[PDB]
Write a protein that binds this ligand. Structure first.
Ligand SMILES: O=C(CO)N[C@H]1[C@H]([C@H](O)[C@H](O)CO)O[C@](O)(C(=O)O)C[C@@H]1O
Length: 308
């Protein structure tokens, strides 16, 4: 094609993210009259999200996904998006990114500093905790060998609830669980399904601890080369795909508990009051480390009403 573009993904081929990326690619090919073709590179074949964000920066990869919270790697205050239990729901995630001074500034910095244009935002689910033994209460977290991604907010979730975290890339998790090198992991329901973690985890606890969005990102080096009509094709396709993407997650949060029960998983509902209480010293540490910018981002987010 005139523009042979590439979309790198950490997710695998059986995921919502992949389905939405397929929709995006098909729409772009059609509405560009075949001038743009977007090939898909899932399963972290190009590296993880941190790696793929670097590839968009240097222009060697055209599209990828990232969470708003992942930008805490560059702007520590952006950890606010994944401080456990701070963002209430997707409604708050959307307004936090687009409708706060903090979020509007973050989007500008991603462009100026990091070489990426934000095309759209989707919902990527609320993280829950799977394990090889029941989590009936916060006590069951104590000493649980909990795999986390290489992200400070997930490490802190594990630490503060009393678990023993082991960081590793998404691709390594299934084997870690299978072999009982670790006892559990935490991810939205849809990822537990996509990765078949349910094959290797007998229990699922509704910890409801971190809310993931998902950003459709394009390399500035690629977006600038597209004539403006093709920029619009890409943007409009990203927005259409993000709505579809969110709906896949919303619907699965209704449908997946019955799916996991049919696969033999036992679902628990621990009292979340002590989970939330346990984060109070973490929020204090966040404010100490990130200073007024962090206090301000928290204030801006805590002001958002979660009811549509
Ligand atoms: O790579 C991306 C891009 O948004 N997100 C990944 C996501 C992300 O890297 C973490 O939430 C940290 O921001 O981590 C996981 O949930 C995981 O490793 O458990 C996989 C998910 O695909």
């Amino acid at each position: 094609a005139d523009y042979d573009l590439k979309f790198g993904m950490n997710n695998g081929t059986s995921s919502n993210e992949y389905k939405a990326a397929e929709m995006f690619a098909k729409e772009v090919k059609e509405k560009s009259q075949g001038k743009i073709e977007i090939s898909l590179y899932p399963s972290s074949q190009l590296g993880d999200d941190r790696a793929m964000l670097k590839q968009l920066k240097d222009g060697s990869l055209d599209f990828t996904f990232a969470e708003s919270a992942r930008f805490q790697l560059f702007y520590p205050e952006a950890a606010v998006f994944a401080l456990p239990y701070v963002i209430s729901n997707y409604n708050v995630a959307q307004k936090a990114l687009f409708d706060t001074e903090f979020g509007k500034d973050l989007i500008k910095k991603m462009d100026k500093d990091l070489g990426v244009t934000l095309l759209s935002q989707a919902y990527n689910g609320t993280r829950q905790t799977t394990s090889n033994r029941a989590i009936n209460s916060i006590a069951d977290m104590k000493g649980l060998k909990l795999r986390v991604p290489n992200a400070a907010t997930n490490l802190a979730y594990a630490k503060y609830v009393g678990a023993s975290p082991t960081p590793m890339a998404f691709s390594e998790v299934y084997l870690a669980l299978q072999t009982n090198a670790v006892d559990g992991q935490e991810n939205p329901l849809a990822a537990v399904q996509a990765q078949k973690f349910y094959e290797v985890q007998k229990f699922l606890a509704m910890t409801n601890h971190i809310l993931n969005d998902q950003l459709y990102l394009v390399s500035n080096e690629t977006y600038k080369e597209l004539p403006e009509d093709l920029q619009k094709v890409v943007k409009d396709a990203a927005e259409n795909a993000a709505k579809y993407h969110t709906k896949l997650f919303v619907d699965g949060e209704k449908d997946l508990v019955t799916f996991f029960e049919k696969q033999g998983v036992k679902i628990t509902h621990p009292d979340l009051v002590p989970f939330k209480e346990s984060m109070k010293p973490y929020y204090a540490e966040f404010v100490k480390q990130t200073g007024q910018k962090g206090e301000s981002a928290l204030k801006q987010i805590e002001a958002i009403n979660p009811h549509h």
